[PDB]
Design an enzyme around this catalytic site. Structure first.
Site, PDB file in Angstrom:
ATOM      1  N   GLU A  23       0.496   6.076  -1.468  1.00 12.20           N
ATOM      2  CA  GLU A  23       0.743   5.024  -2.413  1.00 12.20           C
ATOM      3  C   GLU A  23       1.880   5.325  -3.342  1.00 12.20           C
ATOM      4  O   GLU A  23       2.133   6.481  -3.703  1.00 12.20           O
ATOM      5  CB  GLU A  23      -0.498   4.802  -3.226  1.00 12.20           C
ATOM      6  CG  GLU A  23      -0.556   3.474  -3.867  1.00 12.20           C
ATOM      7  CD  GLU A  23      -1.972   3.006  -3.913  1.00 12.20           C
ATOM      8  OE1 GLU A  23      -2.617   3.042  -2.850  1.00 12.20           O
ATOM      9  OE2 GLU A  23      -2.449   2.631  -5.000  1.00 12.20           O
ATOM     10  N   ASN A 152     -13.228   1.079  -1.698  1.00 10.77           N
ATOM     11  CA  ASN A 152     -12.676   1.666  -2.910  1.00 10.77           C
ATOM     12  C   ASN A 152     -13.733   2.333  -3.721  1.00 10.77           C
ATOM     13  O   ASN A 152     -14.684   1.678  -4.100  1.00 10.77           O
ATOM     14  CB  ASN A 152     -11.986   0.615  -3.776  1.00 10.77           C
ATOM     15  CG  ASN A 152     -11.035   1.229  -4.778  1.00 10.77           C
ATOM     16  OD1 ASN A 152     -10.894   2.449  -4.830  1.00 10.77           O
ATOM     17  ND2 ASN A 152     -10.369   0.403  -5.557  1.00 10.77           N
TER      18      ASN A 152
END
EC number: 4.1.1.48
Length: 220
Positions: A23, A152
């Site tokens: 990311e 998540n």
């Protein structure tokens, strides 16, 4: 065009290499502000990562549509515009920018919006990573027939990292859906652990922006 982030994840699974989705976020509601080069980072990671997750979220994640645009140009590895997709247009922008998929968070979307947003993503040839947090997001991703789920461990609303809960969901996810375990992954120890639990790819970010060289140890 769309280089399936999940397929690559699939090939990494067959290839035995740790499918990790790197990311790029300079600012984040969790981590500290670490400005890096979008191209240096992407360049260093396209050499190892299974794909890049890019945050075009300007406010909380300090990212731009241009960053994504430039990063996508610079690399030949799957990209995921990680934003807060709530309108089909973002899929468009996503596509026309360089995304090979997009982030759909079951929390903030009605079942209807998510279901369509999924349909419209597949019309573009991309398979949106559908992020889930609880028993209720899971059951929806499932109810809309998701094939690329993202569990998540970090709650948007609270920023709390329930890894225990995270793995529960992973157990309740069919072995045909590509599972991407996001947030909280700190060591290669847990990676091979979740990896035993069926997760195929790992979405890491803050540790990699801190010290991108770190991914080198994860991929073992």
């Amino acid at each position: 065009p769309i280089i399936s982030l999940n397929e690559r994840i699939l090939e990494f699974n067959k290839r035995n290499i740790t499918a990790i989705i790197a990311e790029y976020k300079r600012k984040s509601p969790s981590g500290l502000d670490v400005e890096r080069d979008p191209i240096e980072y992407s360049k260093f990671m396209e050499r190892y990562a299974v794909g890049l997750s890019i945050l075009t979220e300007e406010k909380y994640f300090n990212g731009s549509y241009e960053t994504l645009r430039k990063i996508a140009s610079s690399v030949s590895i799957p990209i995921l515009m990680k934003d807060f997709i709530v309108k089909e247009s973002q899929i468009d922008d996503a596509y026309n920018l360089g995304a090979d998929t997009v982030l759909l968070i079951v929390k903030i979307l009605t079942e209807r919006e998510l279901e369509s947003l999924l349909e419209y993503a597949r019309s573009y040839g991309m398979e949106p990573l559908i992020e889930i947090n609880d028993e209720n997001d899971l059951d929806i991703a499932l109810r809309i027939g998701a094939r690329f789920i993202g569990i998540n461990s970090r709650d948007l609303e609270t920023l709390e990292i329930n890894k225990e809960n995270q793995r529960k969901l992973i157990s309740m996810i069919p072995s045909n859906v590509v599972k991407v375990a996001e947030s909280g992954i700190s060591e290669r120890n847990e990676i091979e652990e979740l990896r035993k639990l069926g997760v195929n790819a790992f979405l890491i970010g803050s540790s990699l922006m801190r010290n991108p060289e770190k991914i080198k140890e994860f991929i073992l």
